[PDB]
Amino acid sequence: DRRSIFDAVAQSNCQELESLLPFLQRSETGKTCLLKAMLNLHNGQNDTIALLLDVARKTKQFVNASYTDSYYKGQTALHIAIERRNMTLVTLLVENGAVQAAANGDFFKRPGFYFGELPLSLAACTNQLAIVKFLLQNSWQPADISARDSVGNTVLHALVEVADNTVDNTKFVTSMYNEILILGAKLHPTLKLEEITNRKGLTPLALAASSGKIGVLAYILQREIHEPECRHLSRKFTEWAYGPVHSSLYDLSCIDTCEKNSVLEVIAYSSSETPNRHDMLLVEPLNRLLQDKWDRFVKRIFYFNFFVYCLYMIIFTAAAYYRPVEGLPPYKLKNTVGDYFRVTGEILSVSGGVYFFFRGIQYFLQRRPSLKSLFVDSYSEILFFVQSLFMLVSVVLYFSQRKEYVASMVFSLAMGWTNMLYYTRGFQQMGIYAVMIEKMILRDLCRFMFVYLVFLFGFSTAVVTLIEDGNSYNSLYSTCLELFKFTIGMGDLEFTENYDFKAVFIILLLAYVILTYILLLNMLIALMGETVNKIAQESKNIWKLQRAITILDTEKSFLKCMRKAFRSGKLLQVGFTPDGKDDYRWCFRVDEVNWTTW
Amino acid sequence: LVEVADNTVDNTKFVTSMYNEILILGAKLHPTLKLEEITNRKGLTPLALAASSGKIGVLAYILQREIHEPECRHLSRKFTEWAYGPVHSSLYDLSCIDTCEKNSVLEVIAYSSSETPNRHDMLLVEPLNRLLQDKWDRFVKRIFYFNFFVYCLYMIIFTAAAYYRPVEGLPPYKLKNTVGDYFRVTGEILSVSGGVYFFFRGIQYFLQRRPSLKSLFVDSYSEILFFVQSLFMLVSVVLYFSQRKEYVASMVFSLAMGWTNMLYYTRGFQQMGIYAVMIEKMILRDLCR
Ligand SMILES: COc1cc(CNC(=O)CCCC/C=C/C(C)C)ccc1O
Numbered sequence: 001d002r003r004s005i006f007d008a009v010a011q012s013n014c015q016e017l018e019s020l021l022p023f024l025q026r027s028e029t030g031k032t033c034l035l036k037a038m039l040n041l042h043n044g045q046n047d048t049i050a051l052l053l054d055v056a057r058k059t060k061q062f063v064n065a066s067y068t069d070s071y072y073k074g075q076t077a078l079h080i081a082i083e084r085r086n087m088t089l090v091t092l093l094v095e096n097g098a099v100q101a102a103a104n105g106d107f108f109k110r111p112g113f114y115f116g117e118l119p120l121s122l123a124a125c126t127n128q129l130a131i132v133k134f135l136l137q138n139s140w141q142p143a144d145i146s147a148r149d150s151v152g153n154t155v156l157h158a159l160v161e162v163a164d165n166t167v168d169n170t171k172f173v174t175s176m177y178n179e180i181l182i183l184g185a186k187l188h189p190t191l192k193l194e195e196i197t198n199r200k201g202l203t204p205l206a207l208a209a210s211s212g213k214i215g216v217l218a219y220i221l222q223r224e225i226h227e228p229e230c231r232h233l234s235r236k237f238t239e240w241a242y243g244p245v246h247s248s249l250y251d252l253s254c255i256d257t258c259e260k261n262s263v264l265e266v267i268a269y270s271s272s273e274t275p276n277r278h279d280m281l282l283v284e285p286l287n288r289l290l291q292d293k294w295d296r297f298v299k300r301i302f303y304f305n306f307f308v309y310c311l312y313m314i315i316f317t318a319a320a321y322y323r324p325v326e327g328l329p330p331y332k333l334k335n336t337v338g339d340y341f342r343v344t345g346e347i348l349s350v351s352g353g354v355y356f357f358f359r360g361i362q363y364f365l366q367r368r369p370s371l372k373s374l375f376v377d378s379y380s381e382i383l384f385f386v387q388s389l390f391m392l393v394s395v396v397l398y399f400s401q402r403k404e405y406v407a408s409m410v411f412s413l414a415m416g417w418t419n420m421l422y423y424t425r426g427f428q429q430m431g432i433y434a435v436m437i438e439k440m441i442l443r444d445l446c447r448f449m450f451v452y453l454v455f456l457f458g459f460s461t462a463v464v465t466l467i468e469d470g471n472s473y474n475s476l477y478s479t480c481l482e483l484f485k486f487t488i489g490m491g492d493l494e495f496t497e498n499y500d501f502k503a504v505f506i507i508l509l510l511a512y513v514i515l516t517y518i519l520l521l522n523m524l525i526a527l528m529g530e531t532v533n534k535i536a537q538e539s540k541n542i543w544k545l546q547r548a549i550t551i552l553d554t555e556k557s558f559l560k561c562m563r564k565a566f567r568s569g570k571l572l573q574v575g576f577t578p579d580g581k582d583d584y585r586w587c588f589r590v591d592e593v594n595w596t597t598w
Numbered sequence: 599l600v601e602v603a604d605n606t607v608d609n610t611k612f613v614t615s616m617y618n619e620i621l622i623l624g625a626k627l628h629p630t631l632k633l634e635e636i637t638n639r640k641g642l643t644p645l646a647l648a649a650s651s652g653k654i655g656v657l658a659y660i661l662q663r664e665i666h667e668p669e670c671r672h673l674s675r676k677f678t679e680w681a682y683g684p685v686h687s688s689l690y691d692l693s694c695i696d697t698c699e700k701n702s703v704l705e706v707i708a709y710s711s712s713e714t715p716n717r718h719d720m721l722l723v724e725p726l727n728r729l730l731q732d733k734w735d736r737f738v739k740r741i742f743y744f745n746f747f748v749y750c751l752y753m754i755i756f757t758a759a760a761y762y763r764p765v766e767g768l769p770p771y772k773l774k775n776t777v778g779d780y781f782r783v784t785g786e787i788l789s790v791s792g793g794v795y796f797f798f799r800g801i802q803y804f805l806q807r808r809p810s811l812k813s814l815f816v817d818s819y820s821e822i823l824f825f826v827q828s829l830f831m832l833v834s835v836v837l838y839f840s841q842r843k844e845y846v847a848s849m850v851f852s853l854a855m856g857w858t859n860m861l862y863y864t865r866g867f868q869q870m871g872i873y874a875v876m877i878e879k880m881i882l883r884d885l886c887r
């Protein structure tokens with residue numbers, strides 16, 4: 001009976017198996033007998049697997065027995081052996097004929113564990129170097145290293161897929177990455193594993209850069225290997241050293257400009273769901289690269305753009321200033337030179353407006369941002385787009401015989417000038433100040449203004465339900481104002497004599513002053529102090545990221561003027577390679593010094 | 599053993615050790631008996647006693663208790679349901695944490711009279727954190743938002759009826775045939791009904807909770823304020839059928855407190871609840887000094 005043998009194997013006794021074997025020959029889930037045996041195995045107490053294998057051999061078609069349920073769909077006995085750190089059973093299964101099995105079930109894709117869908121990926125992802133060595137070098141059937149799973153994740157893909165940014169996890173993930181990469185080199189010196197890409201097309205380096213795994217990225221970018229056979233695996237090199245001085249190179253294989261999305265363009269354009277996209281510009285080559293680009297070929301472009309915006313704002317201001325006032329829009333052009341100048345200024349203004357409108361639309365299309373985090377990812381794109389909207393609405397209402405266009409233009413102009421702060425990112429000690437303004441406007445004023453409006457409305461309704469109006473203080477707008485003024489140090493504790501009782505009125509105003517002016521407002525000062533003292537450092541990081549985005553956008557914009565004139569680094573030969581005795585890369589040089597090493 | 603702990607590391611250490619040893623010994627000597635169920639004159643189980651007295655260490659121990667011995671695996675309160683790689687899925691007992699015979703652990707932690715040293719860290723134990731978050735996620739967030747919306751509507755109609763109070767003569771006022779006057783009187787009746795609701799809620803809270811007189815502004819700052827708003831509303835009612843125009847001096851107060859009390863509902867949101875807590879603490883200490 002099937003249940004009798006199941007009970008026996010769970011009992012770890014072979015007596016029933018021995019009794020039934022002669023009769024065996026004489027004659028939902030789908031779990032295999034050997035599968036249950038290894039599952040119900042303690043201290044190697046399960047030996048009936050060998051008996052079952054020998055019985056089957058005495059009778060290929062069984063060494064590939066796999067689960068069927070959607071939860072464990074495809075789960076294989078080799079995977080079960082590996083999960084338990086089984087070497088003897090794994091080797092026995094491999095020799096007997098039981099390495100490219102695909103465990104495409106849900107559990108391997110809710111609560112679950114992802115390692116890839118191959119035995120090699122499982123063995124690597126579980127910190128088992130010896131087992132992966134044997135699996136990839138098993139003589140009966142060698143486990144392939146280039147096998148590709150459903151979503152495309154190979155073993156290196158998976159190793160990136162598993163990190164968590166911790167010290168020990170990053171430690172052994174990097175260790176196994178290095179070992180498996182050297183092993184793939186020696187077994188297949190012709191192949192280059194890293195180039196492989198998943199369904200999304202992201203290289204493991206690009207994947208570790210997008211997902212947020214800084215440790216793996218720092219590793220991959222700072223990678224050098226000395227072995228004579230496989231020195232081509234390096235991305236870093238040392239070009240000389242004299243005393244305590246050194247001069248190293250870096251690879252920049254496709255960091256600068258890559259096939260689809262390089263590392264830098266993916267770090268900068270991360271949608272802020274990533275944990276740390278701000279520390280991820282701390283790696284040495286990226287810091288040096290951004291500083292170099294800023295120094296050489298984009299500081300002048302940024303200052304030119306800033307000067308052009310300043311001039312645009314000056315003419316917009318000085319044309320809006322002299323707007324015609326008599327009659328209705330439009331206005332008939334006078335023969336005077338000044339009127340010509342004014343209309344030229346207006347046309348310049350509207351041209352800038354449409355430019356900014358199209359830039360905003362294009363940014364939206366390319367970037368495809370969310371709706372909940374749109375005021376955290378990009379605070380300034382929204383504001384430039386809004387200024388453009390106001391300018392265009394004013395245009396719409398200036399050819400529509402209406403004088404409300406000014407109410408638009410004013411707004412626009414204000415935003416215009418206030419937006420000059422956008423350009424204070426090219427300077428550190430001002431960019432950090434603008435970042436702090438950003439953060440406070442987003443958090444502190446929102447909280448404080450909700451609470452303050454609750455208090456103000458409560459007490460102003462309480463004070464208009466008292467007045468009787470028997471000027472026109474019997475208003476909720478005018479009471480809302482006269483009580484707002486208290487906050488700006490202009491509150492007149494007696495602004496009206498229309499009230500039944502004086503004690504109630506004055507107790508009401510005193511409670512309001514004590515609760516908002518003395519308590520709340522000084523509390524806001526205190527909370528601003530604490531928030532400043534916290535974000536002192538995150539502001540620097542966000543400024544760095546802002547400037548990085550500025551550099552990337554500028555280089556993308558003027559690819560027409562100089563698409564390849566400004567390439568980072570120099571095309572150098574670091575060394576030879578066994579493949580073709582050629583190793584020429586666009587490498588980047590940095591010096592260094594040290595005294596302890598000597 | 600619960601009666602002796604002091605929340606220190608070593609005292610908690612050996613108190614837990616001896617608790618475990620004596621419990622296993624009682625199991626082996628008397629496998630039929632269950633010691634924990636026993637209760638003192640007050641009727642509090644040792645777990646409930648360690649939860650009420652403030653002994654967080656002993657509570658964390660008792661709630662996170664598992665035993666592997668074949669004979670006495672029934673002593674566990676925690677279990678492991680599977681593990682595949684680096685992953686695990688554990689269970690917890692909740693014997694009578696949720697709803698217990700007289701006073702469960704949770705109802706006794708929450709309702710501690712603040713004489714207890716640390717009733718705020720005592721919700722840091724894993725099962726209680728997870729339980730509170732789960733309940734909030736599933737079946738009470740909607741109820742809280744519904745109550746908050748109802749209070750907002752009550753406050754809006756109270757405000758907009760108090761706003762248009764009749765001004766000529768003395769109270770009461772003869773209902774005009776105008777539709778607006780009908781609307782106004784309906785609003786007033788709604789207001790007073792809410793007022794009596796809040797008054798009875800305050801009285802019931804006092805009776806059940808039996809708080810002190812020196813620490814009444816530390817234990818519950820908002821029950822007092824809701825009760826006071828109800829008192830002002832009821833006094834205004836008393837002076838609106840007593841031919842007197844001082845009722846307004848009451849109502850105004852009431853309304854103010856009303857709107858200011860909306861902050862009570864900012865506890866369902868973390869970054870606003872913390873702000874309201876800070877307002878509470880400053881009003882209690884700094885403004886007084
Ligand atoms: C443009 O980029 C930035 C801009 C700012 C300053 N601008 C603001 O804070 C927005 C204020 C808008 C107020 C306009 C009100 C009108 C309706 C009268 C700080 C950091 C930046 O990165």
Ligand SMILES: COc1cc(CNC(=O)CCCC/C=C/C(C)C)ccc1O
Nearest residue numbers: 511820823851854858859861862874878
């Ligand atoms: C209702 O619960 C809360 C309420 C508040 C704010 N409310 C207060 O501070 C009380 C102020 C009362 C002032 C009234 C004065 C009248 C006499 C004119 C903070 C935290 C909470 O938990």
